[PDB]
């Protein structure tokens, strides 16, 4: 029903998914000039359970790791959130070359990829119901910058051989996503939507200022996945990112100061 191919990509989502036409769509372009510091933004923290990781999969649109969220195992709390959130899954977005691939951009700079750790509020009883709330989902977004190879990330990349084609999935346990977190927890926050259909505007975004580094080699591994089935002819899965959407009247807030634009 949707994808990143020229016939079902971002340019066509609006006529298939009404929400994609909304006023609080994601991603957006971040401009530090217009970002205001909000002392109310408290530090966020995680209580992830490595043993909660269950499956890794390739649905032809991205590669996703699923966690056990039947109860409060891996939690995300603090920050602008109204309560604790359950880690449900994480996936990535990347481009065809290292010069681009991230969905959000900062002051014109684009990254090679973007990691999204998706959580939801248990207060809404069910993940499906959380998608109906403006703050039902909280996503931790991490930028991937080209540089030194990442050892922790390599573990993830090593499992990719199991889900090369669309539809493939494999047991993937023992993995703490927090090991991929950069040293700084400074973040930007705003409210938007899923950057993928149905594009519900139900996400409270937490974008980390400090990017995660990865080597060009490791990025090449991500681009080796297929969006095609084991039968169908090979079709590489690259460019699974959505262009920036109009910010409209939304203001992005920072948990840190950044004195550059003022005094």
Query: Distances in Å between the alpha carbon of 55 and those of 13, 89, 222?
Result: 28, 9, 17
CB 69, CB 120: distance < 8 Å: yes
What is the CB-side half-sphere exposure of residue 21 using CA atoms within 13 A? 6
Cβ proximity to Zn ion: between 104 and 116 the closer is 116
93 is in an annotated binding site: yes
Q: How far apart are CA 62 and CA 225, in angstroms?
A: 9
Cβ proximity to Zn ion: between 116 and 166 the closer is 116
Q: With the C-alpha atoms ordered 145, 149, 152, 158, is the resulting torsion angle positive or negative?
A: positive
Cβ proximity to Zn ion: between 91 and 185 the closer is 91
261 is in an annotated binding site: no
**Residues forming the site for Zn ion (CB under 5 A):** 116
Q: Is 188 helix (H, G, I), strand (E, B) or coil?
A: strand
Q: How far apart are CA 42 and CA 113, in angstroms?
A: 27
Cβ proximity to Zn ion: between 110 and 116 the closer is 116
CB of 262 to Zn ion, least distance (A): 33
Cβ proximity to Zn ion: between 27 and 80 the closer is 27
What are the DSSP calls for 34-61, one per residue?
TPEE-TT-PPEEEE--GGGEEEEEE-SS
Cβ proximity to Zn ion: between 88 and 116 the closer is 116
Cβ proximity to Zn ion: between 74 and 240 the closer is 240
CB of 136 to Zn ion, least distance (A): 15
CB of 4 to Zn ion, least distance (A): 12
91 is in an annotated binding site: yes
* Residue of minimal Cβ distance to Zn ion: 116
CB of 62 to Zn ion, least distance (A): 7
Which residues contact residue 109 at a Cβ distance below 8 angstroms, ignoring those fewer than 6 apart? none
Phi, psi of 256, deg, nearest 5: -120, 170
Which residues contact residue 14 at a Cβ distance below 8 angstroms, ignoring those fewer than 6 apart? 20, 21
CB of 37 to Zn ion, least distance (A): 27
116 is in an annotated binding site: yes
CB of 91 to Zn ion, least distance (A): 6
CA-closest candidate to residue 137, choices 63, 189, 85: 85
CB of 103 to Zn ion, least distance (A): 7
105 is in an annotated binding site: no
In eight-state DSSP terms, residue 122 is G
- Which segments are annotated as binding site for substrate? 195-196
- Which segments are annotated as binding site? 91, 93, 116, 195-196
- Which segments are annotated as binding site for Zn(2+)? 91, 93, 116
């Amino acid at each position: 029903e949707w994808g990143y191919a020229s016939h079902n990509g971002p340019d066509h989502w609006h006529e298939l998914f009404p929400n994609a036409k909304g006023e609080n769509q994601s991603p957006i372009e971040l401009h530090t000039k217009d970002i205001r510091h909000d002392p109310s933004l408290q530090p966020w923290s995680v209580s992830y359970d490595g043993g909660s990781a269950k499956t890794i999969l390739n649905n032809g649109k991205t590669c996703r790791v699923v966690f056990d969220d039947t109860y409060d195992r891996s939690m995300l709390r603090g920050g602008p959130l109204p309560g604790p959130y359950r880690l449900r899954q994480f996936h990535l977005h990347w481009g065809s070359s290292d010069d681009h691939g991230s969905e959000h951009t900062v002051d014109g700079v684009k990254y090679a990829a973007e990691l999204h750790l998706v959580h939801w509020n248990p207060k809404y009883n069910t993940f499906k119901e959380a998608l109906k709330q403006r703050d039902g989902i909280a996503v931790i977004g991490i930028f991937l910058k080209i540089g030194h190879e990442n050892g922790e990330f390599q573990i993830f990349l090593d499992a990719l051989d199991k889900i090369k084609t669309k539809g493939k999935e494999a047991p993937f346990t023992k993995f703490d996503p927090s090991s991929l977190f950069p040293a700084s927890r400074d973040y930007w926050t705003y409210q938007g939507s899923l950057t993928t259909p149905p594009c519900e505007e139900c996400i409270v975004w937490l974008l980390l200022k400090e990017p995660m580094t990865v080597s060009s080699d490791q990025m090449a591994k991500l681009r080796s996945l297929l969006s095609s089935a084991e039968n169908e002819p090979p079709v590489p899965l690259v460019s699974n990112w959505r262009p920036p959407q109009p910010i409209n009247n939304r203001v992005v807030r920072a948990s840190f100061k950044h004195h550059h634009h003022h005094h």
